[PDB]
Design a protein around this ligand. Structure first.
Ligand SMILES: CNCc1ccc2c(c1)[C@@H](CC[C@H](O)CO)[C@H](CNC(=N)N)[C@H]2NC(=O)C(=O)Nc1ccc(Cl)c(F)c1
Ligand SMILES: *[C@@H]1O[C@H](CO)[C@@H](O)[C@H](O)[C@H]1NC(C)=O
Ligand SMILES: *[C@@H]1O[C@H](CO)[C@@H](O)[C@H](O)[C@H]1NC(C)=O
Ligand SMILES: *[C@@H]1O[C@H](CO)[C@@H](O)[C@H](O)[C@H]1NC(C)=O
Ligand SMILES: *[C@@H]1O[C@H](CO)[C@@H](O)[C@H](O)[C@H]1NC(C)=O
Ligand SMILES: *[C@@H]1O[C@H](CO)[C@@H](O)[C@H](O)[C@H]1NC(C)=O
Ligand SMILES: *[C@@H]1O[C@H](CO)[C@@H](O)[C@H](O)[C@H]1NC(C)=O
Ligand SMILES: *[C@@H]1O[C@H](CO)[C@@H](O)[C@H](O)[C@H]1NC(C)=O
Length: 335
């Protein structure tokens, strides 16, 4: 309804590009903030129609555009050329804050699905701290649901609308390019994944009860969405998930079809130089990888899925606003 401002706990003395950007663009965070609880008020939210998501998307585009400058950027006809130094890159949490005369309403219902009326509302001045993690297929390093796993979607009947699965227990994913320079791998504990997908299958079953629930790899698209793509320490990883989204939840029970080995699923990854931009329709070319080992140790806290008797779910993503929504769903700007 208005322009918000960001608060961060950044350094003016870290090189780290999120810190640098935040110190120019954000004010410091309040040491202990004010919350007001209003259980009686009961208010409507719609996470799919949230101006905060667009404000954040604008900001993260700015951050990346100042911070991960490509050597060449191809948009439409033009090519744009510039210094592309290797940088230290590790997302930091950002708080979105209502300016004077406005507030931010938090929905406090642990099982709120992001849409409709919420009973226990709070009013606050800033959101919690959200790390702006850009990625596809798997949401990384977010905040978990307190209770159950929530299933969010603008329209679950519309199979074109992205489904956000909000997890209540994180699943570790470790991705490394060890010390072929492009080639890397990720390890996930197959038991832990096995479980998580048991219970996602349960929740999806509640919303589609006659059908049998299948997980299958991403059918088609650019590499950025047919793989789990993400930025680790400045390098763009593209990780094959066909052993991850590969299972059936039949009748109260999940089978995992992808292989594992010693009880780990290992995804093969490539580090790539030509990137299809998430900010706009265009290509970006970056310099070859830094040497050393590049390793990111991340929590999977959510999934982005797309639905095609049986219902079949594929990993999705590509619109980073869905990543922001997964964090901003319980917030609304008012007054
Ligand atoms: C779900 N709706 C379908 C769908 C699907 C894929 C994509 C979109 C929409 C566009 C969304 C644009 C948005 O509206 C911007 O405002 C976006 C266009 N971009 C092009 N080059 N064609 C395109 N997504 C990407 O390319 C992308 O995610 N790449 C990428 C790179 C680096 C990293 Cl690390 C990364 F994790 C991801
Ligand atoms: C979310 O909850 C609302 C009611 O609050 C309901 O109308 C809607 O269908 C639900 N959506 C999902 C995806 O569960
Ligand atoms: C998480 O939610 C699932 C599905 O909603 C539920 O079955 C499970 O008991 C919950 N687990 C934890 C650890 O909270
Ligand atoms: C969402 O689903 C379909 C679109 O396929 C349509 O009936 C309408 O847009 C929505 N329906 C419901 C029940 O919300
Ligand atoms: C989950 O993974 C563990 C470890 O590999 C395995 O022993 C168990 O049977 C699996 N459960 C399934 C596939 O339902
Ligand atoms: C992932 O790996 C499988 C088998 O290794 C292959 O069939 C599939 O095309 C790969 N997907 C991508 C996007 O590389
Ligand atoms: C599941 O994995 C196996 C081997 O890991 C592969 O042969 C199969 O094609 C995968 N399933 C799908 C639907 O791709
Ligand atoms: C997730 O957080 C950990 C700890 O801050 C970090 O090491 C890791 O690189 C993060 N993952 C991504 C993809 O940013």
């Amino acid at each position: 309804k208005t322009t918000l401002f960001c608060a961060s706990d950044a350094k003016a003395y870290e090189k780290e590009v999120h810190n640098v950007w935040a110190t120019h663009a954000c004010v410091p965070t309040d040491p202990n903030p004010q919350e007001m609880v209003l259980a009686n008020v009961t208010e409507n939210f719609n996470m799919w129609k949230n101006d905060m998501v667009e404000q954040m998307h604008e900001d993260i585009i700015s951050l990346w555009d100042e911070s991960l400058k490509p050597c060449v950027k191809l948009t439409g006809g033009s090519a744009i050329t510039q210094a592309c130094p290797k940088v230290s890159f590790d997302p930091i949490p950002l708080h979105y804050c209502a300016p004077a005369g406005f507030a931010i309403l938090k929905c406090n219902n642990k099982t709120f699905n992001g849409t409709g009326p919420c009973r226990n509302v709070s009013t606050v001045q800033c959101t919690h701290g959200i790390k702006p993690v850009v990625s596809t297929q798997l949401l990384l390093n977010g905040s978990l649901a307190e209770e159950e796993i929530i299933i969010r979607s603008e329209n679950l009947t519309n199979n074109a609308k992205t489904i956000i699965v909000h997890l209540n227990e994180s699943v570790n994913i470790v991705c490394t390019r060890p010390n072929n320079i492009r080639q890397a791998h990720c390890n996930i504990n197959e038991s832990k994944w096995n479980n998580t997908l048991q219970k996602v299958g349960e929740e999806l079953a509640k919303h589609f009860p006659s059908k049998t629930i299948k997980f299958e790899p991403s059918s088609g698209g650019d590499l950025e969405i047919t793989t789990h793509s993400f930025n680790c320490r400045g390098e763009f990883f593209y990780c094959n998930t066909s052993d991850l989204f590969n299972g059936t939840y039949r009748n109260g029970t999940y089978n995992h079809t992808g292989r594992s080995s010693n009880g780990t699923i290992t995804l093969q990854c490539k580090i790539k130089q030509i990137i299809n931009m998430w900010q706009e329709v265009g290509r970006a070319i970056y310099a070859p990888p830094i040497e050393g080992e590049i390793t990111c140790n991340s929590n999977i806290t959510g999934l982005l899925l797309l639905r095609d008797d049986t219902e079949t779910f594929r990993p999705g993503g590509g619109d980073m606003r869905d990543n922001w929504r997964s964090e901003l769903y319980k917030y609304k700007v008012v007054e």
